[PDB]
Write a protein that binds this ligand. Structure first.
Ligand SMILES: N[C@@H](CC(=O)O)C(=O)NS(=O)(=O)OC[C@H]1O[C@@H](n2ccc(=O)[nH]c2=O)[C@H](O)[C@@H]1O
Ligand SMILES: N[C@@H](CC(=O)O)C(=O)NS(=O)(=O)OC[C@H]1O[C@@H](n2ccc(=O)[nH]c2=O)[C@H](O)[C@@H]1O
Lengths: 574, 580
């Protein structure tokens, strides 16, 4: 068996009197009163070792240095005074033996403070990535990686109980000139031919439905060689799943229970079911975003039809006027800050007014008095609030005041806590020629089918986004399983036969052999884990990520190769 | 919820009288006296639907052809005569409604026989791969994929319980397991490439340096080999690593894990512990470092018996290995084994016969002078054939071991069940008989035996390694080792393997630096998951347990990969194809 009797961090008062053998890293050394104190560290926490002058381990304990690997043997004793900041805080190990298994260079940054329950000073992330094997020693990084383990195991437990089959799909697959750029992999035996890394398992998981497996899932790696701004990594992890004989409601209900199971098991958090649902239109109208942050209120209100008789030209002639009531009298500085946020989102400006006990004052207050009673009933505003207005095209006015709404939450210091999931449903299928939103296999709404050719912009898709605290963490749809409907959607998009066969030939042929009704979703697992941990970047929930630029400071990739290794592939740099 | 009330194949007589809603594929249709019988198929199997001419479902049922997708509603009733070949064979569904969800054209090969319990005729594997989404409809393929799911879930259950942390490691990493790298061009700086990982070896050791203590991953490995011997461009490993372990700790945990996997996924009890043979023991007794323990016929050393023999080819040889087969082979069969032997670098194969008193055939004349000792050493009986290979010890063992394996097939020995074993105490270096050079058996991070450290400079060929292979039925299904955690020793072993300081820094500098920050003792292993699943299912190829595999030339008939890309796309990477 092993030489150690326990994880160092697992010792408690229940272990007093036992002789233990421990192995780990020297977190810190302190000399007090002629005793040598060593914080011994492993993944379960710190435990205090004490060397007394008479002990055989005394000289060894004096020479050891931070991050040295040691094996320690001694008796578990009670501390005279407990340190409540350690789970082992009531006990210590009186050393009889101490053996050095590895010395260590002074690390480029400290990794010891979190294990004592102390705040850790921010270090250069580039430094942290270059020495990531040391960065991963820190308590916070190990908790993130172990939560990610618990989340994936919980996904496995749940989906296995619900009859899902995990299926692993190819990594070396067909490159298509369709949309997002592929990472390529040269085929050595025939120069000029390339595999591609997969953008997602979409076509394979649909083909697994055509194969009759009924329900599938995979913790899938997706590779997309595009802009790496906005926290993107060159590859990321999805929870990918697909089901047969389902409606939208079936997919949402399954994913709700799975998510609630994941949060209960991996975080100890209870998520009330069902999640709230909002159509795309409702989300845009009430929050100005298709990923609403539900951790605070302050909904947008359409007040356009209140000013159709008002002399205020800019309100009267606008297609939309959105209003927002902030529960605070803003400074002129804050208003101009919100105005700049609005103008940065294509708005012509931001009108404003304070609401007093009898009327309004400031900004556009004069033009608000004739409609006072109606305006207050629509906005539910009270004396002391500030009313913000954006007038313009409907999408612009909503999106601009929605961004104002988010920035206003920070100005007001609103407490945004917990986890607020919601479904955004009934997205438009297309957008102006015409083009689809995600991928062309998304089914139109059955009752909107006749509008496909008549009024395409009004056609709803059977697609849905999962949103958590203003962040898209999941997206999916019911798929087309009728090849004639799929051809009909292609004819509407202007996508000819030669283009279909080149991009999708093998899958379109698959639909001719009896595809069941099916649909699915993929979660952004790294995004979910970052949100579950309050991390500012998905880099904090990935063991060995790339930096914001796409490179790996730890190993140096991407790096050149000997020209003989490249000549062997039949390629050269131009 | 769902329209569907049950899986089609799950109906039993306990459901008789219930009204059910079912969804699935038409396995087959036959018409009889106006009735329309549809075998409805889903992942649980077949159930018979009956459409009566008086039913509203009848008009729909008349359009239906095989592989059409339908939703059916009706009442479960007993069949007048039951079909004992089906789990639903006692019942049928009297249809009250039927709707076509999807039509289908005739598949290029049948998928229906297996769901009836009937034998499936062999289809061209290239055609099966081209229509892999239809091939995956067959019962055997779904059984394979569902078994694959059960095996991985069992691995998660066991290792999670044992405190292992699953960590996912990079796919776009730095350009080491004895193969060529698959490269990925870095678009922004032409001339820069990522490499796909041949294994997660260095990342999992760094996870030990990070203090995670025990790791696992169901990892995808990419190795650009001459894809002979059923190689796929990428394959799947159960990868794992542990800290503060000796060889025995790694072996015992894997044994218990495998026994759990087989128990939960196959219902098979594997007796523990696994047998253990050293590399030298396995090579002496079986002529192979991956012995097949499903039959006997062990190899015997008889060289010391011929030191007074007139047969110079025996008398000069370092080794003469003998094997006694319980059969009088034909001369054709002997020549076949001789050809096998010669294909494995042997100088030849000798033969004879054991008869009631004397010997007959082949080299029997030179065997007669040494009879008493030979029969005690070989345990040969009348009617047997004795075979010999003479030569250097490793050649003689390997050649007669390959003869041994072939002879098991010629003799029709019933080799059954699952016979695991560990092979341990591998030498640090392997002698390439061809290139006349020392190479490492396992990757350069394998720790030599600590007792042998002074031999690294004094006598490298005597150095043992803390490495081990897991063998199942003569197939290498796992391999691992205790690692080097001292940076001085790791450079010392790099020096031995012919890797100067310049090559060390350029390929492994980041990792040697990590060893300077207090690396713990650690070791681990990796299973060949596709290999194991192929063996668990008796499949002849790992392609039978991979959902969408490549063909033997590493190509995907289903998708057309690998394929050309637009000249514009290759231009953007700053690369061009060399003109021949
Ligand atoms: N095959 C379809 C899913 C389906 O229809 O079933 C698909 O991939 N959709 S997707 O592109 O929206 O990604 C699905 C989800 O993946 C996450 N994500 C996406 C891009 C990225 O860089 N990081 C990231 O975490 C994000 O949460 C998104 O909602
Ligand atoms: N990094 C070490 C593991 C360790 O030392 O912990 C490693 O990869 N070793 S390995 O290369 O032998 O693969 C480990 C195992 O992977 C399987 N296999 C290998 C190559 C291949 O093409 N198909 C296949 O199935 C095979 O069973 C082998 O025993």
């Amino acid at each position: 068996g092993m030489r150690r009797t326990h994880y160092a961090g697992s010792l408690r008062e229940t272990h007093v009197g036992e002789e233990v053998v421990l192995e780990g890293w020297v977190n810190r050394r302190r000399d007090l009163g002629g005793l040598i104190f060593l914080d011994l560290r492993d993944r379960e926490g710190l435990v205090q070792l004490v060397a007394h002058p008479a002990s055989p381990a005394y000289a060894t304990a004096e020479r050891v240095r931070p991050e040295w690997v040691v094996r320690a043997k001694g008796l578990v004793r009670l501390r005279p005074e407990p340190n409540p900041r350690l789970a082992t805080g009531r006990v210590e190990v009186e050393l009889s033996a101490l053996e050095v298994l590895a010395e260590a260079k002074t690390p480029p940054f400290p990794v010891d403070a979190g294990w004592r329950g102390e705040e850790e000073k921010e270090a250069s992330e580039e430094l942290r990535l270059k020495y990531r094997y040391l960065d991963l020693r820190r308590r916070r990084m190990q908790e993130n990686l172990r939560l990610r383990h618990r989340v994936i195991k919980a996904i496995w437990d749940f989906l296995d109980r619900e009859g899902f089959v995990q299926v692993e799909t190819p990594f070396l697959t067909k490159s298509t000139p369709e949309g997002a750029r592929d990472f390529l992999v040269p085929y050595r035996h025939e120069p000029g031919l390339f595999y591609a890394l997969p953008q997602s398992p979409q076509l394979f998981k649909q083909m697994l439905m055509v194969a009759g497996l009924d329900r599938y899932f995979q913790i899938a790696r997706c590779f997309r060689d595009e802009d790496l701004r906005a926290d993107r990594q060159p590859d990321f992890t999805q929870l990918d799943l697909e089901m047969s004989f389902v409606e939208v409601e079936d997919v949402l209900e399954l994913n709700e229970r799975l998510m609630a199971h994941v949060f209960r098991e991996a975080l100890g958090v209870e998520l009330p079911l069902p999640f709230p649902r909002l159509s795309y239109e409702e989300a845009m109208e009430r929050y100005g975003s298709d990923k609403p942050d539900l951790r605070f209120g302050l909904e947008l209100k359409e007040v356009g039809p209140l000013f159709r008789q008002s002399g205020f030209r800019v309100f009267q002639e606008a297609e939309s006027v959105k209003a927002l009531a902030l529960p605070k009298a803003l400074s002129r500085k804050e208003v101009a800050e919100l105005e700049e946020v609005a103008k940065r989102h294509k708005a012509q400006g931001l009108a404003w007014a304070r609401v007093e006990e009898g009327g309004f004052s400031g900004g556009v207050a004069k033009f608000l008095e004739p409609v006072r009673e109606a305006l207050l009933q629509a906005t539910e505003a009270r004396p002391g609030d500030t009313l913000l207005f954006v007038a313009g095209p409907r999408k612009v006015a909503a999106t601009a005041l929605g961004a104002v709404r988010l920035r206003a939450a920070d100005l007001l210091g609103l407490k945004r806590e917990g986890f607020r999931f919601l479904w955004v449903v009934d997205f438009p299928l297309l957008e102006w020629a015409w083009t689809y939103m995600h991928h062309p296999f998304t089914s139109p709404h059955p009752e909107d089918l006749p509008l496909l050719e008549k009024d395409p912009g009004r056609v709803r898709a059977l697609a849905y986004d999962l949103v958590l605290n203003g962040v898209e963490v999941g997206g999916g749809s019911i798929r087309i399983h009728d090849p004639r409907l799929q051809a009909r959607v292609f004819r509407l998009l202007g996508i000819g036969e030669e283009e279909q066969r080149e991009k999708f030939g093998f899958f379109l042929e698959a639909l001719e052999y009896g595809a069941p009704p099916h649909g699915g979703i993929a979660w952004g697992l790294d995004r979910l884990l970052a949100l579950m941990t309050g991390s500012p970047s998905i880099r904090e929930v990935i063991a060995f990520p790339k930096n914001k630029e796409g490179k790996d400071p730890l190993t140096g990739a991407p790096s050149p190769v000997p020209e003989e290794q490249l000549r062997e592939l039949g390629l050269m740099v131009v």
